[PDB]
Amino acid sequence: YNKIVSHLLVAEPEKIYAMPDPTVPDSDIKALTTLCDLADRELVVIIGWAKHIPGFSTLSLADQMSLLQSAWMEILILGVVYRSLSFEDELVYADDYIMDEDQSKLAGLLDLNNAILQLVKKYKSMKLEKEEFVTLKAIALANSDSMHIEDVEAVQKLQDVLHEALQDYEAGQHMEDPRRAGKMLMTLPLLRQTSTKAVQHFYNIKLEGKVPMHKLFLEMLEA
Amino acid sequence: YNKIVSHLLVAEPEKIYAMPDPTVPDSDIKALTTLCDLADRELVVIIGWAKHIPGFSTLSLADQMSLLQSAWMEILILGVVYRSLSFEDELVYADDYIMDEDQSKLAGLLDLNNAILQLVKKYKSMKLEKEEFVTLKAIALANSDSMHIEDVEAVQKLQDVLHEALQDYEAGQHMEDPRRAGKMLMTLPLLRQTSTKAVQHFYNIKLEGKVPMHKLFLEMLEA
Ligand SMILES: CC[C@@H](C)c1ccc(O)cc1
Numbered sequence: 001y002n003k004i005v006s007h008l009l010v011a012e013p014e015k016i017y018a019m020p021d022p023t024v025p026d027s028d029i030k031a032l033t034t035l036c037d038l039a040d041r042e043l044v045v046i047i048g049w050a051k052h053i054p055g056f057s058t059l060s061l062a063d064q065m066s067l068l069q070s071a072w073m074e075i076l077i078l079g080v081v082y083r084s085l086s087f088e089d090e091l092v093y094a095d096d097y098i099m100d101e102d103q104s105k106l107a108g109l110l111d112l113n114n115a116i117l118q119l120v121k122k123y124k125s126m127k128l129e130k131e132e133f134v135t136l137k138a139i140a141l142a143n144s145d146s147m148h149i150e151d152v153e154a155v156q157k158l159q160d161v162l163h164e165a166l167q168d169y170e171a172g173q174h175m176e177d178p179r180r181a182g183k184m185l186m187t188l189p190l191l192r193q194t195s196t197k198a199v200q201h202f203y204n205i206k207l208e209g210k211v212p213m214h215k216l217f218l219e220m221l222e223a
Numbered sequence: 224y225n226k227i228v229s230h231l232l233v234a235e236p237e238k239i240y241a242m243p244d245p246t247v248p249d250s251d252i253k254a255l256t257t258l259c260d261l262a263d264r265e266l267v268v269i270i271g272w273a274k275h276i277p278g279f280s281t282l283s284l285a286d287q288m289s290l291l292q293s294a295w296m297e298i299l300i301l302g303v304v305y306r307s308l309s310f311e312d313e314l315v316y317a318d319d320y321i322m323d324e325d326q327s328k329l330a331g332l333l334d335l336n337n338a339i340l341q342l343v344k345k346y347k348s349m350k351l352e353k354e355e356f357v358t359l360k361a362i363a364l365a366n367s368d369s370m371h372i373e374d375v376e377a378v379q380k381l382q383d384v385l386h387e388a389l390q391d392y393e394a395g396q397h398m399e400d401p402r403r404a405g406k407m408l409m410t411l412p413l414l415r416q417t418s419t420k421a422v423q424h425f426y427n428i429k430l431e432g433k434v435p436m437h438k439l440f441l442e443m444l445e446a
């Protein structure tokens with residue numbers, strides 16, 4: 001099938017571990033610290049991953065950072081969603097950090113994690129493929145609606161290149177459903193909505209000052 | 224072209240006036256009261272409009288209301304956006320209520336109205352047509368991601384019928400751009416984001432209790 005899709009597949013990062021501190025008592029603070037620390041390390045990996053997207057590295061450093069600052073949480077959430085597809089009512093933040101309803105309640109994340117589980121439910125019903133997941137991650141980055149873009153035409157070209165990849169993949173692999181590409185694009189509003197819910201919640205956590213956060217995570221959060 | 228598109232065009236409601244009270248001094252309260260009153264009357268019209276969407280009235284009354292309660296602000300905002308396409312840095316809430324930057328600041332709506340203006344800017348660049356606007360309004364309704372749907376398969380059918388209409392319209396009218404339908408769908412995340420910003424802001428206004436709101440508007444806001 002489509003070369004861009006194949007390329008994104010081989011550029012897919014290895015999974016990383018959450019490593020919750022086994023000496024620390026379980027608490028909302030522990031859970032939130034673990035998740036923010038995981039997100040910080042995933043962000044480093046995402047920045048490295050983005051250089052493999054055709055045309056992305058040719059953008060100005062400012063536009064690269066604008067896209068990332070707008071899209072980072074959508075990319076993080078798409079990851080948890082994809083890792084969670086073979087599970088039921090649990091979120092696989094990492095192989096060693098799987099959150100069920102009880103844990104979500106303990107962390108103060110019941111509403112957010114239920115929203116993420118709504119995304120999981122929809123992609124389950126659509127039988128989301130890894131090929132589609134990696135392409136949607138790239139599309140979310142290109143389509144992230146930053147207000148600070150310098151070269152708008154180049155960003156549009158990036159959107160178009162990735163959209164074409166999705167269109168082509170679906171036309172070849174899913175002839176039984178001539179509207180599958182569009183159905184995939186129609187999942188992006190819920191991703192955007194859920195990401196905004198997450199950013200707002202963790203921004204509040206940042207303000208309260210009880211959960212330690214690393215530099216990159218804080219930078220993205222404050223952007 | 225496509226029959227569903229033609230149908231949605233003839234089902235398009237007439238414009239309504241804002242009628243700000245000429246005896247009341249200008250204030251943030253006046254502006255916000257005017258806008259909420261306008262929105263209340265537009266919601267009545269939207270409910271009437273939705274019965275013309277193929278298949279919508281065959282849904283249970285509960286599912287009809289779930290869709291509307293999720294999508295109402297996206298539909299309102301799409302309306303202001305479309306009315307504003309031939310203007311610059313102004314929002315045409317009604318023929319008699321056009322908001323510029325100064326008015327937005329006075330109303331406490333600078334951030335929200337700038338976000339809406341970002342939608343306007345994007346649709347301007349794409350040369351959004353009335354045909355596309357009415358179809359996107361219907362798609363936003365069907366794709367509104369309510370968590371309370373009874374007949375999920377029927378709602379999916381509704382999404383599919385309207386998506387097919389958009390696909391068919393673009394294939395016939397815009398052969399020069401085989402990705403135009405997808406580009407249109409890719410504007411929906413920003414619509415969702417902007418709508419959520421609006422709902423959250425006016426929910427806060429509701430809590431503060433200084434701006435009078437009518438029953439239907441309050442019901443939608445509280446849903
Ligand atoms: C605040 C980030 C948190 C919600 C999170 C989301 C996704 C992920 O992969 C790691 C952490």
Ligand SMILES: CC[C@@H](C)c1ccc(O)cc1
Pocket residue numbers: 258259261262265299300302303316421425
């Ligand atoms: C709170 C509703 C307000 C933002 C509004 C939005 C669109 C519209 O057509 C009328 C009012």
